[PDB]
Amino acid sequence: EMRELRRQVDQLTNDKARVEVERDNLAEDIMRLREKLQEEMLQREEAENTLQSFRQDVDNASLARLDLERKVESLQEEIAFLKKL
Amino acid sequence: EMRELRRQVDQLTNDKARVEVERDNLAEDIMRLREKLQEEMLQREEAENTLQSFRQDVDNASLARLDLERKVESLQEEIAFLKKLH
């Protein structure tokens, strides 16, 4: 039907044109999001590495504290022996 | 006649269907990327918060170690003095 046909073509062309704009823009968006994701993932690994390193420093200090506490106890015992001759 | 009109109708119909499928696919990917990005940023923020909490709590432990070290030195001095007596 000639009426119905031309009806189709006319706006079909515009409709396709609209979806192509949407598609293009989404393609730009995904390019920007991929970029952001790579940036953020590197920055997340970095924060987690800095935190891991800090925790290692804290553990190493805690061991140093324990050794000092044992050294104090030992030295106090020596003092006692000296006061006892 | 209408050959051309019909040619255009069928071609536009096929193209629009193709582009709509691609648009749907990009929207799905964007949904996933936004979700992943949110999750990555949260985990970074958690790491940064925990590091902030640890950095603001270093004084108690460090004071303890410094005083213990001073105490060891003090006791060594007392031992050195006591060792001079008969």
Side-chain angles (χ1 to χ4, degrees):
Chain A
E1 300 137 88
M2 184 59 98
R3 292 225 183 136
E4 287 84 335
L5 177 63
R6 182 88 184 54
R7 179 60 178 163
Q8 275 165 3
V9 156
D10 177 6
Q11 64 179 16
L12 219 46
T13 298
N14 179 250
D15 283 23
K16 169 188 152 192
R18 307 269 295 178
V19 63
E20 287 196 312
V21 170
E22 296 181 40
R23 189 266 325 275
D24 289 345
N25 283 282
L26 288 191
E28 290 291 349
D29 291 341
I30 185 166
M31 218 183 326
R32 180 190 83 249
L33 290 176
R34 282 180 183 265
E35 280 187 341
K36 281 181 175 56
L37 180 57
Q38 186 183 2
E39 291 181 333
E40 291 302 321
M41 288 180 317
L42 288 187
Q43 290 180 14
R44 174 196 169 261
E45 181 184 29
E46 169 183 346
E48 286 187 348
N49 280 334
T50 297
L51 175 52
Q52 174 177 345
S53 289
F54 187 92
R55 281 201 179 190
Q56 298 170 351
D57 289 332
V58 171
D59 289 327
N60 285 319
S62 287
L63 288 171
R65 174 172 181 171
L66 173 63
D67 187 69
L68 285 170
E69 289 167 341
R70 290 299 178 271
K71 287 301 195 296
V72 166
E73 299 163 15
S74 288
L75 290 165
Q76 306 237 20
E77 293 177 350
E78 293 177 350
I79 297 291
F81 173 76
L82 271 290
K83 295 178 181 168
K84 289 200 170 165
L85 272 293
Chain B
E1 295 302 320
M2 51 222 296
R3 174 169 300 272
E4 299 315 309
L5 275 159
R6 184 48 65 196
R7 185 197 311 267
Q8 177 76 258
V9 164
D10 290 336
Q11 183 62 56
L12 291 166
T13 291
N14 185 281
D15 288 336
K16 196 175 74 63
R18 179 182 38 82
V19 171
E20 284 177 345
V21 166
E22 178 180 7
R23 180 183 48 55
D24 293 334
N25 285 350
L26 293 173
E28 189 191 347
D29 287 349
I30 289 195
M31 200 224 66
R32 290 183 190 282
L33 281 154
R34 283 182 183 167
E35 183 179 9
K36 182 61 167 51
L37 180 63
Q38 175 181 36
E39 297 174 354
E40 287 291 327
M41 288 188 299
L42 177 60
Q43 293 177 335
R44 171 159 74 98
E45 187 169 10
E46 292 289 356
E48 288 174 351
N49 177 61
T50 300
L51 180 59
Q52 181 180 66
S53 178
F54 286 164
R55 278 176 175 167
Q56 220 55 16
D57 183 37
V58 297
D59 283 340
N60 283 332
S62 66
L63 176 65
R65 293 189 309 267
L66 290 172
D67 285 346
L68 279 162
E69 169 171 89
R70 172 204 296 152
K71 184 61 178 182
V72 159
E73 176 177 13
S74 186
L75 297 174
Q76 293 283 10
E77 290 170 8
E78 175 168 22
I79 285 169
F81 171 79
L82 283 175
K83 266 293 179 59
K84 290 181 176 49
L85 295 174
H86 305 81

